[PDB]
Design a protein around this ligand. Sequence first.
Ligand code: NA
Length: 124
Amino acid sequence: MNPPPPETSNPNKPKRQTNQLQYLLRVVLKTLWKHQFAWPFQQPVDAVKLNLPDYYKIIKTPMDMGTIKKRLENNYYWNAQECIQDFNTMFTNCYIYNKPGDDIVLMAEALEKLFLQKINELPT
Ligand code: NA
């Protein structure tokens, strides 16, 4: 009843390593990954275990930090903006599905605040 997770590697997609991508993996993602609030974002939303039958009726573009982490480790991204887009998908899904002041939303907002600070420090 869960959808398959987003793809995290693709043999047909060109690959490269850049400073911005190495920074996204070794600084931005690590920082968020080890945050007190990271657990619910470390894997795709499991609508079965969470008992959310409408999650994937509302959320059609799922994203999560476990997928982002794999995509980085697998050199899935060609540029930093693809990865930043995935983070904003993850956050935006949370804010769309949930309500203001929900525990998961407040947790999302703290991680996004942190993400935004690290993304402001992106190497050129
Ligand atoms: Na909302």
